[PDB]
């Protein structure tokens, strides 16, 4: 990690084209010797490189995986990385070691940290949650009782409390993912926010905004603003033709409803899995990202831009069969 | 160099290149290096490929 | 710009109270903490005799008296929220009363996470050490030897993170702490011994595996019995090694105990106050044993009576118990051996004016005198009251017995419109029975809004009260819809119609709905001795704030800032909306401007163009931090209170589209109070705005020229070179902008309380400060004193 609000210079990979969320995996595939040379020195010194977002902000990444597939007389290096701290660029100079100013995380005490009665301070710790809709009222009443000392009520203060918001987000992620109830979601809100920013099918301009947000409380609200209003996902190159909606979002396996995958040639594709959608080829199985499924290309019916893939296979009564996979980069969320 | 002109695979020598070239051929060889689209002529691939995240 | 803040009314709410022998070894002193104010008394046969009052540079959080061996009298220890520690002695040279500081030091650690149950300060029985629970897992220790003048401390690690309350144990071979803590297994009580040589913990006399789920209080029972008492939700327990006792009194199942006090040093009688003002006596039935030993047979709790919602308690003498309160009036009460006709053993001896919590105010001069009064909302639950302050300060009181939310002044009817919130409970019959008759139920005329437009636990019911400005009587009480919550209220003119109207902004709070999806903006008319339903508009959200924007009703529905138009058909039409990304909670205007803000310091300056007929964003300045209130100084500057207890002042820049759209912050000041509402008015300089806080303090904020600002800022640095402080605390450190992590020196503000302390200083120091810069300064201070 880097000192908060410090200025360091970090190498940048020119092949990367993604906007990196902290706590998100960055698959790679490197052919040219210039990129491969950079990965080597990183594991020796800091193991950190920059992933510029498009050129104002970005995220640093740490190398955590490193394979070597010397095949057909050429060395194909397979590296995975995870995002660290956000930043704002100072000056890039392809010699591209970029001058970088680290952006610190803005943490805030509870809304009642100043209006809490010293007599009621000892009653601020609760017995652990039973694993209900009745319990959460007691949480609001007990922790926000001291809102009567202020001009604002209890229910309003709940919509700025990390724990209150974080549960409502988890409630929706249980519809998308049937296997998302345990320790799969960090307890710390600053990390919980970043984890949903990657897990959300949203275009790039939204992803940059959620990176510029300083407080996780704001980020959590912004992430909930998106999850409640944008029920529709459309095509970005024609806009007014809606492809699929939130109600069909499915999670095929453990890695959530949206996971990063790589094509045989080295191109990252974050494919959201759904059940049906509206608006090229025959079932092929080579390099099938989902074992037991055969991929088929799909495009839009107004602009003919790439939308994603449809996976269909036989086996037996394998669940599911008719399910799609749309790439994030070619999706635009809209408000129905 | 020494790169394939269908699946866009890169090889170190021109020998292993021509060893691979006579393997796609099926009245639709030009495969998109991003979405696996099947094209007939190189003029089709050059357009669609640049209509893709790049 | 540069501003000037001065305290108009000292804080009234009491957050601390302890007995002891501070002034004279034989006198019985009652020390009282009113936030930043320390009141010293002497307990006479009648009541309290004022002795001294001092102001510390820091909100007092921990206050304890202790008498080390070989000391004239008891000494005082005070720890602030800024982690300022000090030892205080009394010194009376004939008639000059002085409070010298024997030792002073700051104990803030660079690292550390403030604990969930706040700061806890405890002192060893034998005055050997001072334990301070500042952060989770860290136990700071100040050793009590008379060579520790700087209070250098050493920390110890605590394997327990979620500790609730901790006391020093009584009657032990070594300084022993006892505390209740929580781990995933449950809630436990554990003890440690404290070694000063090893500077670590040793094994504790005992350890009890389990305790009550919501155990909150730890009381150290003195030498006669020993051990410690643990009070929780419905169980009171006693622990001391092999000795264990537990009781489940049904009389304390209704509420939760939050404050206590020891009556006699024997520990046999204990006072217990809860959250609803109730008073309890905890009795330790000691059994005289056959060989000079004394055991403990049973435990008992009896209902004494009912006081003001108690923050702290303290028995004085002859049944006189001081009841300190943060919501209602501090009380001195007498206890009676005999149960009166009702059942209470308590009769009110005295009352102390407590303005806090001030949740709303409005500047008026009902006498038409051209001077300025102040009618505020005060208290909560039964402690609800209005307090009219004049000019000392004449503080009237109008008990309401329920929570006053909002207030405004109407003049065409010469009355006041007041929003109120009373708490009710579900009965088996199927109603919402009230706890006590209050201003809502005890009114002359009732009015339940029917509307029907949207067709045993606590439930809130909001009401609108009309109160004549002379008798302050309950004229009319309007009951809003079942499950409706009123938010804002204003009295103004609707453009051309001379009819003055009462307008209330409401919501529709349900537990299943986390966001407000409905609401109402209701207009009312009080003239014919009754309230009139002058049409209500159905919106789709909460109506947080409302302002009169020149003949047009400005409303805020969630994020949509929206102008409403009073039509000639006695109804409201939507003119134009300025949609926003943040929740439009705050809303203030200044002619044609609009100042929108949310709970997270998101200042957003709009501008209404009359020819365009719509609002247009002019600037913004987001800086995520908890904002309590915000007001408009003038067309350029803006003022608000944020974070802990600070005050900020942003303004507009002096060529770029991105630089004229970035509001620059210029004023940073740590006021010391939590400001809930600003109000314009008063009771050279320009602009007079007053504010009401939770601790009852009222202060005035005014502007200054650059000449006076540069001069007053020069005086402040010189003033703090002769003026003696209480705990030897630098003033700049106290006024510095303090959050929970950010710590920056103050700038853009001038402390009026420090300026008006030049008149109370002597001549040798009056002329020492003004050197290289006497009557000239007197004239300046005199003029400012009028504010
Ligand atoms: N066989 C080819 C050939 C070229 C490009 C791609 C594939 C291919 O399979 N995928 C994806 C999508 C389909 C899939 O299941 N896995 C992949 O790696 C490509 O982008
Ligand atoms: Zn399209
Ligand atoms: Zn090929
Ligand atoms: Zn393609």
Residue numbers in the entry:
A (entry chain A): 72 to 125, 133 to 173, 178 to 213, 220 to 367, 371 to 427
B (entry chain C): 381 to 434
C (entry chain B): 2 to 392, 709 to 772, 783 to 981, 984 to 1012, 1023 to 1112, 1126 to 1139
Describing publication, verbatim:
The design of highly selective low-molecular weight glues (MGs) that cause the degradation of a specific protein and exclude others is an area of significant interest in the drug discovery process. Both globular proteins and C2H2 zinc-finger based transcription factors that contain a beta-turn are known to form complexes in the presence of MGs known as immunomodulatory imide drugs (IMiDs) that bind to CRBN, leading to ubiquitination and proteosome-mediated degradation. MGs can recruit or degrade more than one target; for example, pomalidomide (POM) and CC-220 recruit and degrade transcription factor IKZF1 along with SALL4 and several other targets. SALL4 degradation is linked to developmental abnormalities and avoiding off-target degradation is desireable.
Furthermore, the addition of C-terminal residues PQVKA to SALL4 ZF2 results in increased degradation relative to ZF2 alone. The affinity of ZF1-2(370–454) is 52-fold more potent than ZF1-2(379–432), likely due to the inclusion of the PQVKA residues that resulted in more potent affinity for ZF2(405–437). For ZF1-2(370–454), C-terminal residues P433 and portions of Q434 are visible in the X-ray structure, and P433 interacts with CRBN S420. A model of the interaction of ZF2 residues P433 and Q434 suggests additional contacts with CRBN residues M88, S420, V128, Q129, and Y355 and these interactions may be responsible for the increased potency observed for ZF2(405–437) and ZF1-2(370–454) relative to ZF1-2(379–432) and ZF2(405–432), which lack these residues. The C-terminal residues P433 and Q434 likely contribute significantly to this interaction; ZF2(405–437) is 68-fold more potent than ZF2(405–432) alone, and these residues are visible in the CRBN:POM:ZF1-2(370–454) structure. Overall, these findings are consistent with engagement of both SALL4 ZF1 and ZF2 with CRBN:MG complexes as well as the previously reported involvement of C-terminal ZF2 extension PQVKA.
